[PDB]
Write an enzyme that holds these catalytic residues in place. Structure first.
Site, PDB file in Angstrom:
ATOM      1  N   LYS A 112     -15.200   3.722 -31.779  1.00  0.00           N
ATOM      2  CA  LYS A 112     -13.958   4.021 -32.471  1.00  0.00           C
ATOM      3  C   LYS A 112     -13.353   5.275 -31.855  1.00  0.00           C
ATOM      4  CE  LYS A 112     -11.784   4.332 -37.027  1.00  0.00           C
ATOM      5  NZ  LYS A 112     -10.662   3.454 -36.592  1.00  0.00           N
ATOM      6  N   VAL A 136     -10.727   0.516 -32.156  1.00  0.00           N
ATOM      7  CA  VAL A 136     -12.133   0.304 -31.812  1.00  0.00           C
ATOM      8  C   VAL A 136     -12.234  -0.456 -30.493  1.00  0.00           C
ATOM      9  CG1 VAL A 136     -14.345  -0.714 -32.531  1.00  0.00           C
ATOM     10  CG2 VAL A 136     -12.849   0.350 -34.226  1.00  0.00           C
ATOM     11  N   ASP A 165     -11.383   0.666 -50.087  1.00  0.00           N
ATOM     12  CA  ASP A 165     -10.588  -0.441 -49.565  1.00  0.00           C
ATOM     13  C   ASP A 165     -11.396  -1.483 -48.789  1.00  0.00           C
ATOM     14  OD1 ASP A 165     -10.921   0.875 -46.994  1.00  0.00           O
ATOM     15  OD2 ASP A 165      -9.157   2.085 -47.422  1.00  0.00           O
ATOM     16  N   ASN A 184     -13.769  -5.742 -42.683  1.00  0.00           N
ATOM     17  CA  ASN A 184     -14.834  -4.740 -42.733  1.00  0.00           C
ATOM     18  C   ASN A 184     -16.216  -5.365 -42.864  1.00  0.00           C
ATOM     19  OD1 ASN A 184     -12.673  -2.698 -44.813  1.00  0.00           O
ATOM     20  ND2 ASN A 184     -12.935  -2.600 -42.578  1.00  0.00           N
ATOM     21  N   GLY A 229      -8.565  -0.784 -37.736  1.00  0.00           N
ATOM     22  CA  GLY A 229      -8.662  -0.689 -39.195  1.00  0.00           C
ATOM     23  C   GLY A 229      -7.321  -0.307 -39.786  1.00  0.00           C
ATOM     24  N   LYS A 257     -12.482  -4.687 -47.257  1.00  0.00           N
ATOM     25  CA  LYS A 257     -11.662  -5.815 -46.800  1.00  0.00           C
ATOM     26  C   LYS A 257     -12.525  -6.765 -45.992  1.00  0.00           C
ATOM     27  CE  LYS A 257      -7.662  -2.939 -45.695  1.00  0.00           C
ATOM     28  NZ  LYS A 257      -8.567  -1.751 -45.698  1.00  0.00           N
ATOM     29  N   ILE A 280     -11.607  -4.101 -29.415  1.00  0.00           N
ATOM     30  CA  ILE A 280     -12.320  -4.872 -30.433  1.00  0.00           C
ATOM     31  C   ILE A 280     -11.456  -5.129 -31.670  1.00  0.00           C
ATOM     32  CG2 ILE A 280     -14.011  -4.488 -32.291  1.00  0.00           C
ATOM     33  CD1 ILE A 280     -16.123  -3.952 -30.251  1.00  0.00           C
ATOM     34  N   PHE A 338      -6.477   3.004 -39.421  1.00  0.00           N
ATOM     35  CA  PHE A 338      -6.176   4.102 -38.500  1.00  0.00           C
ATOM     36  C   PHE A 338      -7.023   4.002 -37.228  1.00  0.00           C
ATOM     37  CE2 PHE A 338      -8.402   5.482 -42.414  1.00  0.00           C
ATOM     38  CZ  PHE A 338      -9.706   5.606 -41.936  1.00  0.00           C
TER      39      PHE A 338
HETATM   40  O1  LIG Z   1     -12.860   1.597 -39.004  1.00  0.00           O
HETATM   41  C1  LIG Z   1     -12.746   0.568 -38.353  1.00  0.00           C
HETATM   42  O2  LIG Z   1     -11.615  -0.148 -38.139  1.00  0.00           O
HETATM   43  C2  LIG Z   1     -13.850  -0.094 -37.651  1.00  0.00           C
HETATM   44  C3  LIG Z   1     -14.994   0.628 -37.406  1.00  0.00           C
HETATM   45  C4  LIG Z   1     -16.037   0.020 -36.743  1.00  0.00           C
HETATM   46  C5  LIG Z   1     -15.947  -1.292 -36.329  1.00  0.00           C
HETATM   47  C6  LIG Z   1     -17.074  -1.896 -35.648  1.00  0.00           C
HETATM   48  C7  LIG Z   1     -18.260  -1.209 -35.497  1.00  0.00           C
HETATM   49  N1  LIG Z   1     -19.126  -2.017 -34.817  1.00  0.00           N
HETATM   50  C8  LIG Z   1     -18.531  -3.206 -34.525  1.00  0.00           C
HETATM   51  N2  LIG Z   1     -19.131  -4.194 -33.864  1.00  0.00           N
HETATM   52  C9  LIG Z   1     -18.316  -5.248 -33.720  1.00  0.00           C
HETATM   53  C10 LIG Z   1     -17.018  -5.357 -34.174  1.00  0.00           C
HETATM   54  C11 LIG Z   1     -16.256  -6.575 -33.976  1.00  0.00           C
HETATM   55  C12 LIG Z   1     -16.567  -7.469 -32.972  1.00  0.00           C
HETATM   56  C13 LIG Z   1     -15.846  -8.627 -32.793  1.00  0.00           C
HETATM   57  C14 LIG Z   1     -14.790  -8.909 -33.626  1.00  0.00           C
HETATM   58  C15 LIG Z   1     -14.461  -8.030 -34.633  1.00  0.00           C
HETATM   59  C16 LIG Z   1     -15.193  -6.876 -34.803  1.00  0.00           C
HETATM   60  C17 LIG Z   1     -16.457  -4.292 -34.851  1.00  0.00           C
HETATM   61  C18 LIG Z   1     -17.245  -3.169 -35.031  1.00  0.00           C
HETATM   62  C19 LIG Z   1     -14.790  -1.999 -36.585  1.00  0.00           C
HETATM   63  C20 LIG Z   1     -13.735  -1.404 -37.246  1.00  0.00           C
END
Ligand SMILES: O=C(O)c1ccc(-c2c[nH]c3ncc(-c4ccccc4)cc23)cc1
Length: 285
Positions: free
Chosen positions: A47, A32, A129, A134, A27, A131, A24, A29
């Protein structure tokens, strides 16, 4: 060797409970992954962080605009965190497709982010942070922020930066000076998100990263005359370089809450999702 994960911890859960589909995102660190629970037959975002990155690790906070944590577990090498899969798309993907948002819509998203930040500050937690990566929308079009309580301070970040075209982040003047993270950095980041929602580019922008850092620290705020005076006033307040003069320095969220830009917001209605969102993502799940 078992790390304390908190109340969310699951002694019964193993990776073999999950069908892992694709990556997916990443971040600062770890990674996902999109996962379908084998038995339950539903989709989650898992994650996965490696134990050789820890140098109370998890403090989950429930809030309508913070991504929900279902449970967490660990193996010998890796820590796993099961979150809601948020399918309404990244906020800034919708911004991309539209160049910029009208103020009423921008106001709605800024207000939801503000309430989550203000809630976090009341529990003595700082976002640090915030962004664009996020900031997601759920199926209904409400804001969902991806922080679920991991202690960023105890986890080794992967953060080099490129001279041109870096990772989209909103580094406050005090962050560049490597001063302690406090609640006023979150307000700088809010103002930068709002700025970008209105103008289609982060404030102080440059293709060159060093130039951008230079602009953040030394160049006066540039507000082109296409937004209301209340929007101008809020951005002038939130994007002050001196954090002691910044909007939120003396009364935190109450200063943003009571700002004229958010006069039309009923904060009780908003937080309880009683306000129909200004945009419906073309999906449901
Ligand atoms: O700490 C982190 O990097 C972090 C922690 C949780 C997530 C996260 C939780 N649920 C999600 N659902 C969908 C997507 C998503 C789906 C398509 C495109 C982009 C993102 C991402 C998440 C993401 C990053």
């Amino acid at each position: 060797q078992q790390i304390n994960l908190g109340p969310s911890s699951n002694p019964h859960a193993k990776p073999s409970d999950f069908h892992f589909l694709k990556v997916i995102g990443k971040g600062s660190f770890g990674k996902v992954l999109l996962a379908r629970h084998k038995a339950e037959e539903v989709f989650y975002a898992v994650k996965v962080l490696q134990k050789k990155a820890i140098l109370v690790l998890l403090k989950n906070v429930k809030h309508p605009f913070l991504v929900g944590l279902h449970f967490s577990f660990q193996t010998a090498d890796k820590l796993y965190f099961v979150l809601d899969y948020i399918n309404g798309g990244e906020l800034f993907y919708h911004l991309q497709r539209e160049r910029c948002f009208l103020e009423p819509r921008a106001r709605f998203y800024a207000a939801e982010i503000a309430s989550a930040l203000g809630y976090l500050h009341s529990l003595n937690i700082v976002y640090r942070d915030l962004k664009p990566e996020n900031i997601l929308l759920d199926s209904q079009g409400h804001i969902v922020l991806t922080d679920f309580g991991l202690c960023k301070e105890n986890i080794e970040h992967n953060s080099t930066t490129s001279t041109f075209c870096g990772t989209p982040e909103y580094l406050a003047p005090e962050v560049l000076h490597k001063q302690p993270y406090d609640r006023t950095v979150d307000w700088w980041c809010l103002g930068a998100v709002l700025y970008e929602m209105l103008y289609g580019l982060p404030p102080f922008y440059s293709r060159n990263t060093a130039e951008m850092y230079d602009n953040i620290l030394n160049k006066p705020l540039q507000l082109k005359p296409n937004i209301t005076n209340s929007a101008r006033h809020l951005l002038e307040g939130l994007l002050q370089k001196d954090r002691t003069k910044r909007l939120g320095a003396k009364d935190d969220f109450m200063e943003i809450k009571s700002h004229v830009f958010f006069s039309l917001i009923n904060w009780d209605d908003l937080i309880n999702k009683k306000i129909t969102p200004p945009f419906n993502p073309n999906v449901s799940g």
